[PDB]
């Protein structure tokens, strides 16, 4: 989670970075109870069910927009950031988290590499990117390499002075997206053991013997897990 939820962020909304998270246990309780983030908006996911739900793929997108346009990274939102830069139709029941980057933006005035796609011919497709420096032209005269009164530039930087801001000041938005393909889902999440104290119902891993437990001495192979002495009745477990 830290690889994305916590790193120096030079990512810009114009070229957002995506990460494939899989083959790992996923504890979301740490993110939910962190209270180190300004927002944790979640749509079609329940906070209790987030750990319970298992997912084939986990995709995390990291980008930096001003405080005012954090709202635009949401389903059914219209604005320069959502249409031209980063778009979420439903977010696939994903969760959007914002952390203030004003502390990250050190110095009296650093624009870094943050840029906004003000000029784009059309609206992007869900989870799509755009990195064309192609001059907008915005006129009958075709703009090539030479600059023109109408050539302009598609990307414009954002000034992040520490003083004031708040709206101009950016909360880095990291979007989570969990999809469910045919491939098996391993993305999800014990008590003390009393032996012979009393008859106790139980579930070790998938079985429910509901019988008193005692110390055994039977020889047992390594790769094996449990034993069925007769009539497919489970007598011993490891």
């Amino acid at each position: 989670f830290g690889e994305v939820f916590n790193a120096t962020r030079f990512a810009s909304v114009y070229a957002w970075n995506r990460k494939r998270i899989s083959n790992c246990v996923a504890d979301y309780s740490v993110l939910y109870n962190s209270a180190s983030f300004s927002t944790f908006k979640c749509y079609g996911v329940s906070p209790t069910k987030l750990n319970d739900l298992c997912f084939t793929n986990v995709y995390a997108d990291s980008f930096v927009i001003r405080g005012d346009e954090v709202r635009q990274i949401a389903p059914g939102q219209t604005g320069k950031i959502a249409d031209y830069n980063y778009k979420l139709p439903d977010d696939f029941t994903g969760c959007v988290i914002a952390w203030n980057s004003n502390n990250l933006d050190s110095k009296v005035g650093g624009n870094y590499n943050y840029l906004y796609r003000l000029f784009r011919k059309s609206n992007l497709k869900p989870f799509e990117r755009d990195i064309s420096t192609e001059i907008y032209q915005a006129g009958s005269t075709p703009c090539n390499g030479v600059e023109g009164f109408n050539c302009y530039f598609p990307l414009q930087s954002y000034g992040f002075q520490p003083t004031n801001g708040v709206g101009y000041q950016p909360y880095r938005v990291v979007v989570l997206s969990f999809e469910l393909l045919h491939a098996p889902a391993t993305v999800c999440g014990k008590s003390t053991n009393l032996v012979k104290n009393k008859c106790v119902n139980f579930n070790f891993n998938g079985l429910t013997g509901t019988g008193v437990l005692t110390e055994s001495n039977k020889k047992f192979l390594p790769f094996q897990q449990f034993g069925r002495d007769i009539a497919d009745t489970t007598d011993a477990v490891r």
Epitope: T78, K80, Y84, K121, S122, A138, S140, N150, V166, G167
Partner: antibody, heavy 117, light 110 residues
Framework: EVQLVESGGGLVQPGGSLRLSCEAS????????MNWVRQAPGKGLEWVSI???????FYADSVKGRFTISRDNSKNTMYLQMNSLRAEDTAVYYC???????????WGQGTLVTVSS | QSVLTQPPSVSAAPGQKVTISCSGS????????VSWYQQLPGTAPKLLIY???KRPSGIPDRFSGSKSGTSATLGITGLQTGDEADYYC???????????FGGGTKLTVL
């Protein structure tokens, strides 16, 4: 040379439907962010609607619902249609080109829309 | 709709610098760029200030502007007969998503 030509403002009664058109040279209407702004006689400018290049439409709560807008790529024209005409509507409407939200440039002479008995 | 406050009139003799100040809030002026537009009587307004301090191409000199946080001021060394006109200040209001323009200041070259 960029030019702006507009017509369609006329005497009308309240609740009426009226349309405006704006014509431009050297600038493509769809590619360029376009705006519609109005001035009541001897009164401060009031912004009405902006159309983003992809197709986003934003309006003002004062003119919300009563006003409507579209841009036609084939005719290279921007259209402002206004229903539910009100006492306030009387003004000269100037179509304008904006560098995103940074600033408005190339204002047009506009046409006087008059609503009265 | 929040409206920026503008001085109702500013009058000076020729050869005197003139300052016009646009009142503002973080929701509008504090977080977004401000521009000044000059409308002669009977003409559509022409952009006077390109972006905060910046000046657009095609604009006479002696015209300069300063964004002092919430409020932005416009400075004009000398008041020539042409300078007399109406000036307006505009910025995007993030919360209501509307350009906000002040009523205007009627400059009178005396």
């Amino acid at each position: 040379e960029v030019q702006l030509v507009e017509s369609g403002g006329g005497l009308v009664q309240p609740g009426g439907s009226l349309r405006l058109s704006c014509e431009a040279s050297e600038i493509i209407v769809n590619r360029n962010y376009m705006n519609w702004v109005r001035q009541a006689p001897g009164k401060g400018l009031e912004w009405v609607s902006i159309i983003y290049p992809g197709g986003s439409t934003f309006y003002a709560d004062s003119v919300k619902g009563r006003f409507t807008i579209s841009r036609d790529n084939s005719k290279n024209t921007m259209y402002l249609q206004m229903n539910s005409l009100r006492a306030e509507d009387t003004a000269v409407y100037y179509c304008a080109r904006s560098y995103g939200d940074f600033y408005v440039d190339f204002w047009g002479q506009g046409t006087l829309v008059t609503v009265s008995s | 709709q929040s409206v920026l406050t503008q001085p109702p009139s500013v009058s000076a003799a020729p050869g005197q610098k003139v300052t016009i100040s646009c009142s503002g809030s973080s929701s509008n002026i504090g977080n977004n760029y401000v521009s000044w537009y000059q409308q002669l009587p009977g003409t559509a307004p022409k952009l006077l200030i390109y972006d905060n301090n910046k000046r657009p191409s095609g604009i006479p000199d002696r015209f300069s502007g300063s964004k002092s946080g919430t409020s932005a001021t416009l400075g004009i060394t000398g008041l020539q007969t042409g300078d007399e006109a109406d000036y307006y200040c505009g910025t995007w209001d993030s919360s209501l998503s509307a350009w906000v323009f002040g009523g205007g200041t009627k400059l009178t070259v005396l």
